[PDB]
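Input record, target 12 of the design panel.
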């Protein structure tokens, strides 16, 4: 397993728990309705240690870039400004966010050709499945 295996355009095909996760983050109604309705593509690109993740839906486009292992300021889709670190560890990309004394982790892994995204904050979870598309 390598980080390069995560590269490409991926399309959301299933979501569980996301609304509960957004509620744990304290996201307000407008953004929760967007999160519930949007069916994003995620575009992952990497060159060595540089990683970029872009998302595109009918509602919103987002993007961040980082160096694997380096702490950086991430402005999230819900508007937090987190201290984030991304690492490819034990066959997953792990995105660890810290802000205001809180923490949340997002993992991304290839399983049976699909991109499995899992979110957690304070034992509130979600699982989002994406299929590789052209
Ligand atoms: C604030 C509520 O909306 C959203 O969060 C949201 C996205 N969130 C994410 O991309 C991450 C969310 C956290 C898990 C990893 C990612 C994933 O979705 O798989 S993309 C997106 C869009 N382009 O439309 C929207 C609206």
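The sequence produced for target 12 reads:
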């Amino acid at each position: 397993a390598t980080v390069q295996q995560l590269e490409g355009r991926w399309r959301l095909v299933d979501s569980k728990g996301f609304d509960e996760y957004m509620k744990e983050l304290g996201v307000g109604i407008a953004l929760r309705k967007m999160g519930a309705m949007a069916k994003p593509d995620c575009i992952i690109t990497c060159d060595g240690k540089n990683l970029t993740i872009k998302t595109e839906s009918t509602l919103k486009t987002t993007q961040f870039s980082c160096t694997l292992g380096e702490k950086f300021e991430e402005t999230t889709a819900d508007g937090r400004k987190t201290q984030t670190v991304c690492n490819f560890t034990d066959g997953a990309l792990v995105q660890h966010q810290e802000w205001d004394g809180k923490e949340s982790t997002i993992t991304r892994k290839l399983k049976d050709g699909k991109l499995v995204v899992e979110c957690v904050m304070n034992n509130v979870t979600c699982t989002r499945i994406y299929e590789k598309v052209e």
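The CA atoms of residues 14 and 85 lie 26 Å apart.
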